[PDB]
Amino acid sequence: AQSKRSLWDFASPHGLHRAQDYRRELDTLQSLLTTSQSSELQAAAALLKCQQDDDRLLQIILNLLHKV
Amino acid sequence: QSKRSLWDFASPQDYRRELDTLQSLLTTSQSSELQAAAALLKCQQDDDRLLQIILNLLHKV
Amino acid sequence: ITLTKRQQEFLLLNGWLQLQCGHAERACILLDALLTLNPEAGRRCRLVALLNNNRAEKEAQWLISHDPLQAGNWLCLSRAQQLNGDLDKARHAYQHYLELK
Amino acid sequence: ITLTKRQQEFLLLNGWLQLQCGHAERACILLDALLTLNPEHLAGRRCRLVALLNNNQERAEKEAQWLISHDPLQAGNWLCLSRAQQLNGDLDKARHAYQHYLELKDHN
Amino acid sequence: GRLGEQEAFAMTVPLLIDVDSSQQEALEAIALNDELVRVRRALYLDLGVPFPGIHLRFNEGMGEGEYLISLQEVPVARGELKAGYLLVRESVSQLELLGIPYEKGEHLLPDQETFWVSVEYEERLEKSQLEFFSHSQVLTWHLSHVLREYAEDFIGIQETRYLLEQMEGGYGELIKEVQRIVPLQRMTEILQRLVGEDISIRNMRSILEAMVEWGQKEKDVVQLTEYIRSSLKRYICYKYANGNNILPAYLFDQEVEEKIRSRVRQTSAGSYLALDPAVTESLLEQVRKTILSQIQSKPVLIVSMDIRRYVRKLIESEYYGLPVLSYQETQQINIQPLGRVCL
Amino acid sequence: RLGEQEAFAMTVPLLIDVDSSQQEALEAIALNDELVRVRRALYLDLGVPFPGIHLRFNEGMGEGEYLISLQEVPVARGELKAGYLLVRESVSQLELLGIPWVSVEYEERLEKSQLEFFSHSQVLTWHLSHVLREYAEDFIGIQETRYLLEQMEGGYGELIKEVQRIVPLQRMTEILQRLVGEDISIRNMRSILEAMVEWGQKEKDVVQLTEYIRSSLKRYICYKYANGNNILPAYLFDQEVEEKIRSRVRQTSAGSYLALDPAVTESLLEQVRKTIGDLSQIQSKPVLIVSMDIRRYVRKLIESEYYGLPVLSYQELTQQINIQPLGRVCL
């Protein structure tokens, strides 16, 4: 109850506009981590590529529909 | 009280999960009573599989 | 073979429903499995199942001579003996149940 | 191979979002990468502790020890330990840690 | 009243709450008659459904702690819990409760984990700030749950007509236009479908404007109600996007959407989605593999509009929580793809 | 007393919830007159009949949290760090590093430097004005259009009676909403109604009719988008791009949306971005000028990125205008 909410509030950080900043940081991080040789950074890079292309698919779907 | 007192004397969604565990437990069995119980459980397990098929076919949206 | 009360309750409820829905054979087999596994509620259910199926007296003797905490143990015996052909002793058992009430 | 503060903030936000969407393991992977690159900030560790608690993993005790040995001024550091100890079976120690957290919250 | 009177007909009460006796005057201390109207009014403000009057009765035929809530003289929520005698309950009991384990016990299933503690432990347990549902709180919680899950039965033709007549002074021409465009039956069915998705009726102006705009173009109830849902873009966005621009998504693959759309079956109204039991089982298995209740942001499924409802009833059986949204339903939203439902 | 049915109440159209710690401290500032003043100014600029504004002081929130909600749904949630003392600056730049939200002690010396000084009322009304301008389409309903028509009955009776018999209320309201969506003022209702009468008998599609009504406001558009002396900056489109866009008009039963191919729109948007060039460094409000039949189709193509840059039709341009082409969008 209260303890679970306190856990989530403790984990919580938060003011960033995101939007364009999200896609720009995604592309920079994916190209930074692609060069890496560590395993943890390899898993992180694959996760970022996954989100980068699921987002590319949703941008394509929004572009494809449009209701003037 | 009549027969109601008799019924009172006899008286006391994880259902499918317990069903599947019990059916696989009793399948290993060898005694006659447990064999009859396992066959009864398989019977009900497949009448339920038929009703799941009926529920899937029956939709209204 | 070993189990816990979790599955035993599933078996108990299924046996009770089958007995209350005139099958009694399915309840008898399920309760036979229950008693063969856990011999320690199910005894009363299988007693009533044998009464409605028609052997019942032998099972009723266990409950009467080892679980004297229930007054219902003298109705089932009566029914069992009325299946066996002892009406006067069944009346005596009914009087015993009335005395224990 | 260092990260920009912008990039560290992106990783923090993504980890928080993954925690906020139940994918505890995905948040753990993101925050583990962030800490392996920049270990300086403990907010990523702070949230990955709760992520590991929700992930059902002794590792939580180690992370709580890090937080207690580097930021012992937050009473929240005593809930995770409690959870870890109640997850690891040491219920009595969890009771003691919870009482300590209550005392520190009363202090705060 | 004699043996010549025909029947003395009487209509069934819409909503009834029958609680046990020995709490007629032992209870009612706190409100018992103001808390109920408060929670009903709050739920209406959250939803907009014109909930009916609440009939409260004390029956001594039952036991000591059994309360039942019945809709139209049919019991819909029973429970043998008047907090025992005074044992208040805990709603989020878990191993967290074993952290400070006061005496506890289980009972009938009202919803989530529930255990009961005595009033002497109440002080030290509230020092731990856990949730404390009293008799009034648990009764009103059950009432609110019943109203939320059965609100479709509170929207009839009479209720919609009352709503329209109450707004005649405000927007007369709008009401006359929506009346001339669509009938009462379609409007009430649309409102019921909207409430079935936890979409609030409260903002009736935009609903009527969307009804006017799209009622001349579409006659199918499903498409019209999907358009009306898409007319509430910002409301849906604020209701689900808890943070600034955070919208959790479980987006569907194009192949899966095409497979779902392949069996719309618009034969005799209804528009039931029957593909094949094996196919729906496989799709549900894929969704389960991709997609737990240990979440806090309430993630939402986002799929193509034309099949949105068809998808919802597909996952309502298991994932009653997870909502389903249409792409048409606003901008400036950061949709976060948690995972593609592959085929 | 559990006998009332529901006590129905309609949702408030516009609500502003501010903290309780400025209920009477922010009173002498005349925020209740500033709000009506800015609303009246916005109406005079646009003509949209904005609703009444309800102002309430809620103590649940703290600090200077203010929220503006349309129909009990928040559309602008701002936090005023300016609550205590910190007056703000809107054109803060690197130049502010040379002479450095600011306190009221710096206000005198900064106004000696003559910068933009938004007080609490000014920032609140700025946010309100932005909300009203970007959400004016939600303030034009059937009831509002009927009120506008009834208000002009004494002035132009026969004109209203004819335009009502020519086009219905729904189409007229949709046309007004589309006009306002491009920041075109409704205020000059006479010419709009005359264009509605003239072109409503010929065209039934909403897009074409509203394009004709836009073209009926040539001089208004010219004055609004050309502050100079008949000089209008333009980013005219090539014939090839216009033909490619027009090739996928897709005029269906409900909506003439131009979904062509995502890659094609991506390439066209890249070409537009390469052409237009800078965004913030550009002044004098350049406008895009394209063929009328696709004007809206072009606008919705660039509304995602270039919300600023307006889109105009060749028909919307009157004569005696020196159109200066800043660059052709090549293919």
- Cα separation of F95 and F116, whole Å? 14
The count of other CB atoms within 10 Å of the CB of residue D65 is 13
Tokens of F138: 């939600």
Contact E54, E40 (CB under 8 A): yes
Contact F192, F212 (CB under 8 A): no
- Cα separation of F137 and F180, whole Å? 7
Tokens of F246: 């027009």
DSSP per position, E175-240: HHHHHHHS-HHHHHHHHHHHHHTT--SS-HHHHHHHHHHHHTT--SHHHHHHHHHHTTHHHHHHHH
Tell me which amino acid residue D96 is.
H
- Cα separation of F83 and A17, whole Å? 23
Q: How far is B31 from chain C (nearest CA, A)?
A: 9
The answer to whether A67 contacts E328, with C-beta atoms less than 8 Å apart, is yes
Q: Give contacts of D74 with chain A, Cβ < 8 Å.
A: 10
Q: Are 3 or more Cβ–Cβ pairs between B and E shorter than 8 Å?
A: yes
The answer to whether A3 contacts E296, with C-beta atoms less than 8 Å apart, is no
Contact B12, C10 (CB under 8 A): no
**Under DSSP, is residue E305 helix (H, G, I), strand (E, B) or coil?**
helix
Cβ neighbors of F281 (< 8 A, separation 6 or more) are none
Contact D80, D86 (CB under 8 A): no
**Residue E27: CA atoms inside 13 Å, Cβ hemisphere, count?**
23
Contact E138, E56 (CB under 8 A): no
- Cα separation of E256 and E249, whole Å? 16
Name the residue among F57, F67, F53 with its Cα closest to residue F19. F57
The answer to whether E234 contacts F1, with C-beta atoms less than 8 Å apart, is no
Resolution of this structure in Å = 4.1
- Cα separation of F178 and F174, whole Å? 6
Q: Give contacts of D87 with chain E, Cβ < 8 Å.
A: 95
Contact D22, D42 (CB under 8 A): no
Name the residue among E135, E151, E147 with its Cα closest to residue E39. E147
User: Which residue, chain included where needed, has tokens 């499918």?
Assistant: B16
Cβ neighbors of C63 (< 8 A, separation 6 or more) are C43, C44, C47, C70, C73, C76
**Under DSSP, is residue F329 helix (H, G, I), strand (E, B) or coil?**
strand
Q: Give contacts of E313 with chain B, Cβ < 8 Å.
A: 59, 61
Name the residue among E141, E96, C76 with its Cα closest to residue A2. E96
- Cα separation of D38 and D44, whole Å? 10
Regarding the domain delimited by C5-101, which CATH topology (the fold level of the hierarchy) does it fall under?
A: 1.25.40
The count of other CB atoms within 10 Å of the CB of residue E63 is 11
- Cα separation of D58 and D77, whole Å? 15
Name the residue among F166, F208, F222, F215 with its Cα closest to residue F191. F215
Q: How far is E99 from chain F (nearest CA, A)?
A: 33
**Under DSSP, is residue E139 helix (H, G, I), strand (E, B) or coil?**
helix
The count of other CB atoms within 10 Å of the CB of residue F130 is 12
* E20 membership: H or E segment, kind and range: strand E15-20
* E89 membership: H or E segment, kind and range: strand E89-90
Between chain A and chain D, how many beta carbons pairs sit less than 8 Å apart? 66
Q: Taking the C-alpha atoms of B43, B44, B47 and B49 in order, what is their torsion angle to the nearest 10 degrees?
A: -110
Query: Does A32 touch chain D if contact means CB atoms closer than 8 Å?
Result: yes
Contact E341, E287 (CB under 8 A): yes
The answer to whether D21 contacts E297, with C-beta atoms less than 8 Å apart, is yes
Pairing of the two strands E115-116 and E246-249: unpaired
- Cα separation of D10 and D7, whole Å? 5
- Nearest-by-CA chain F residue for E231: F138
User: Which residue, chain included where needed, has tokens 């500032």?
Assistant: F29
* E247 membership: H or E segment, kind and range: strand E246-249
Interface residues from chain E to A (CB-CB < 8 Å): 90-92, 96, 128-131, 244-245, 249, 251, 296, 327-328, 332, 334-337, 339-340
- Cα separation of F109 and F117, whole Å? 12
Instruction: Report the first-to-last Cα separation within chain A, whole angstroms.
Output: 47
The answer to whether A65 contacts F257, with C-beta atoms less than 8 Å apart, is yes
> What is the DSSP code (8-state) at residue F22?
G
- Nearest-by-CA chain E residue for D54: E294
* F193 membership: H or E segment, kind and range: helix F189-200
**Under DSSP, is residue F17 helix (H, G, I), strand (E, B) or coil?**
strand
- Cα separation of F163 and E180, whole Å? 20
Out of D7, D16, D36, whose CB is closest to A25?
D7
Query: Does B18 touch chain C if contact means CB atoms closer than 8 Å?
Result: yes
Contact F234, F286 (CB under 8 A): yes
Backbone angles phi, psi at F68, to 5 degrees: -115, 120
Q: Give contacts of F255 with chain A, Cβ < 8 Å.
A: 67-68
Radius of gyration (C-alpha) of chain F in whole angstroms:
23
The count of other CB atoms within 10 Å of the CB of residue F281 is 6
How far is CA C33 from each of CA C42, C43, C45, rounded to the nearest angstrom?
A: 10, 11, 13
Q: Give contacts of F8 with chain E, Cβ < 8 Å.
A: 50, 162-163, 166
Contact F189, F47 (CB under 8 A): yes
Name the residue among F294, F290, F296, F293 with its Cα closest to residue F314. F290
> What is the DSSP code (8-state) at residue B57?
H
* 3-state SS track over B6-36: HHHHHCCCCHHHHHHHHHHHHHCCCCHHHHH
The answer to whether D17 contacts E99, with C-beta atoms less than 8 Å apart, is no
The answer to whether A68 contacts F300, with C-beta atoms less than 8 Å apart, is yes
Q: Are 3 or more Cβ–Cβ pairs between D and F shorter than 8 Å?
A: no
DSSP per position, F29-98: T-HHHHHHHHHHHHHHHH------EEEEEESSS-TTEEEEEESSSEEEEEE-TTTTT-BEESS--THHHH
Backbone angles phi, psi at F144, to 5 degrees: -65, -45
> What is the DSSP code (8-state) at residue D3?
P
- Cα separation of E180 and B16, whole Å? 51
Q: Give contacts of F10 with chain E, Cβ < 8 Å.
A: 167, 170, 204-205
The answer to whether E213 contacts F141, with C-beta atoms less than 8 Å apart, is no
Regarding the domain delimited by D5-106, which CATH topology (the fold level of the hierarchy) does it fall under?
A: 1.25.40
DSSP per position, F115-184: --EE-HHHHHHHHHHHHHHHTGGGG--HHHHHHHHHHTTTT-HHHHHHHHHHS-HHHHHHHHHHHHHTT-
- Cα separation of E333 and E41, whole Å? 32
Q: How far is E313 from chain B (nearest CA, A)?
A: 6
Pairing of the two strands E301-303 and E246-249: unpaired
Q: Give contacts of A51 with chain E, Cβ < 8 Å.
A: 336-337
Residue extents of the structural domains in chain C: 5-101
Q: Give contacts of A62 with chain E, Cβ < 8 Å.
A: 327
**Relative orientation angle of helices E277-290 and E254-261, to the nearest 10 degrees:** 150
Does the CA dihedral E99-E104-E109-E110 come out positive or negative? negative
Q: Are 3 or more Cβ–Cβ pairs between F and C shorter than 8 Å?
A: no
E336 DSSP β-pair partners: E248
Q: How far is D16 from chain A (nearest CA, A)?
A: 7
- Cα separation of F258 and F242, whole Å? 12
Contact F160, F149 (CB under 8 A): yes
**Residue F216: CA atoms inside 13 Å, Cβ hemisphere, count?**
22
Instruction: Report the first-to-last Cα separation within chain E, whole angstroms.
Output: 69
Name the residue among F311, F326, F47, F30 with its Cα closest to residue F193. F47
Backbone angles phi, psi at F260, to 5 degrees: -95, -80
Interface residues from chain D to A (CB-CB < 8 Å): 1, 3, 6-7, 9-13, 16, 19, 26, 29-30, 32-33, 36-37, 43, 46-47, 49-51, 53, 74, 76, 79-80, 83
- Cα separation of E221 and F54, whole Å? 36
Q: Give contacts of F174 with chain E, Cβ < 8 Å.
A: 213
Name the residue among D19, D21, D22, D41 with its Cα closest to residue D30. D19
The count of other CB atoms within 10 Å of the CB of residue E113 is 13
The answer to whether E92 contacts A51, with C-beta atoms less than 8 Å apart, is no
Contact F166, F200 (CB under 8 A): yes
**Residue E314: CA atoms inside 13 Å, Cβ hemisphere, count?**
31
